[PDB]
Amino acid sequence: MEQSASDSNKSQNAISEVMSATSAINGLYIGQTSYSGLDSTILLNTSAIPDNYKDTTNKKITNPFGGELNVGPANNNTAFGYYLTLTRLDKAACVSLATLNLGTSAKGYGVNISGENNITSFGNSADQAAKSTAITPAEAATACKNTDSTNKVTYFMK
């Protein structure tokens, strides 16, 4: 109730985690242009067409590495660095990220998108669309919308 709330409080804590993630993974690779090399391997690794870009149950976010992770590089480091396809989600997490601020401390957020290598264009809404900034109940209403069996989100985060 009353605004996103987590967009100011929870965000400050989330930033630390992800900014440490991109730092850690980078320190192990040393740029590699943009973790290049993993692409060719991982792409054909899973069915040649990585179905992991989406979960069929309700739990996959491409970003973290706390559970079932799949490593992959993006197009160009500056635009997008890396993506890790982690299966894991919850209805609360859907609202949590939409009540966060995924814009200043994110590279992009896309719900029901598949193809982390080259994410779709970013607007400001969710579901079969990606957005540049995530915030306010408006996003929350759009992110958690018909998303049950189709509840999966690839998202690059800084």
C-alpha to C-alpha distance for 95 and 49, rounded to whole angstroms: 29
Return all residues near 75 (Cβ < 8 A) that are at least 6 apart.
34, 117, 118
> Helix crossing, 91-98 with 136-143: angle to 10°?
150
With beta carbons less than 8 A apart as the criterion, state whether 119 and 82 touch: no
Element (H, E) at 153: strand 153-156
| 98-131: burial string, b at 16+ Cβ within 10 Å, e else | bbbbbbebbbbbbbbbbebbebeebebbbbebbb
With beta carbons less than 8 A apart as the criterion, state whether 29 and 35 touch: yes
C-alpha to C-alpha distance for 154 and 116, rounded to whole angstroms: 6
C-alpha to C-alpha distance for 137 and 98, rounded to whole angstroms: 7
The three state secondary structure string of 52-114 is HHCCCCCCCEECCCCCECCEEECCCCCCCCEEEEEECCCHHHHHHHHCCCCCCCCCEEEECCC
* Structural domains of the chain sorted by starting position, each given as residue range(s) with its CATH number in brackets: 1-158 (3.30.1690.10)
C-alpha to C-alpha distance for 76 and 24, rounded to whole angstroms: 18
With beta carbons less than 8 A apart as the criterion, state whether 28 and 49 touch: no
Q: How far is CA 95 from CA 3, 113, 135, 138, 143, in A?
A: 12, 17, 10, 10, 7
C-alpha to C-alpha distance for 116 and 36, rounded to whole angstroms: 14
